[PDB]
């Protein structure tokens, strides 16, 4: 459900940026990554990314685990439009199938495989 | 154009400070004050202020002139969102009309009445 990025910036400015950035960075996609509110995981220092389209979701997952400073014993799951995405998809394919009307892809993360309950 | 306070703190890190300071200091507003690039006046030692809402822009002006050690023959002008604010407005009103999305009001200063 609720991403803080959408509450922090007016839609009009997010969409205008989203349009620009797809032209300027043709091999990357703009992605917001935020902690699900009930997750018992550290927050990220940075939530706003330009991500190579060819990177798989699985590889992006390991990059985000590293940036959270998770220990190996900590579980982590992603949610995109309320579902856990496949690790083999590319970030470009996930973006194409899931970006919002501001041209951003929104990824939530949690230590449990349920979101927003 | 660009405030260095905004390149140092991620929008998330300055907005965190902004939201938590509005509740803690309910009669003051958070204000960043920075020298315009081409200003021929001294740099200001501290950039971050909690300013009483009832203080007028003109009173704030006199405080800032003192903090940069201006002589009375030195001109100084403020710019907020590219406009020079009236001295009779309160800082609370100026904040209500001009704060950015991180809940900070940004004031640039210069010795000339043109910015950027």
């Amino acid at each position: 459900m609720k991403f803080q990025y959408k509450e922090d910036h007016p839609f009009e400015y997010r969409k205008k940026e989203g349009e620009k950035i797809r032209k300027k960075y043709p091999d990357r996609v703009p992605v917001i990554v935020e902690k699900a509110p009930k997750a018992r995981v550290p927050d990220l220092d940075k939530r706003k990314y330009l991500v190579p389209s060819d990177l798989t979701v699985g590889q992006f997952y390991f990059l985000i685990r590293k940036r959270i400073h998770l220990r190996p014993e900590d579980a982590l799951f992603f949610f995109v439009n309320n579902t856990i995405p496949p690790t083999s998809a590319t970030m470009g394919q996930l973006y194409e199938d899931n970006h919002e009307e501001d041209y951003f892809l929104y990824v939530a993360y949690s230590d449990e495989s349920v979101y927003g309950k | 154009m660009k405030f260095q306070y905004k390149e140092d703190h991620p929008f998330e890190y300055r907005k965190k400070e902004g939201e938590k300071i509005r509740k803690k200091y309910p009669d003051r507003v958070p204000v960043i004050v920075e020298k315009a690039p081409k200003a021929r006046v001294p740099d200001l030692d501290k950039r971050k202020y909690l300013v009483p809402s009832d203080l007028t822009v003109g009173q704030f002006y006199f405080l800032i002139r003192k903090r940069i050690h201006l002589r009375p023959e030195d001109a100084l002008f403020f710019f907020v969102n590219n406009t020079i604010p009236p001295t009779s407005a309160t800082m609370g009103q100026l904040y209500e009309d001009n704060h950015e999305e991180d809940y900070f009001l940004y004031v640039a200063y210069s010795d000339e009445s043109v910015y950027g």
């Binding site: 990025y5 950035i21 940075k46 706003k48 990314y49 330009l50 990177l55 | 390149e7 929008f11 950015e100």
Partner: peptide
């Protein structure tokens, strides 16, 4: 825009 992107390497 007010919030910078972190540009990840290709």
């Amino acid at each position: 825009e007010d919030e910078d992107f972190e540009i990840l390497s290709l």
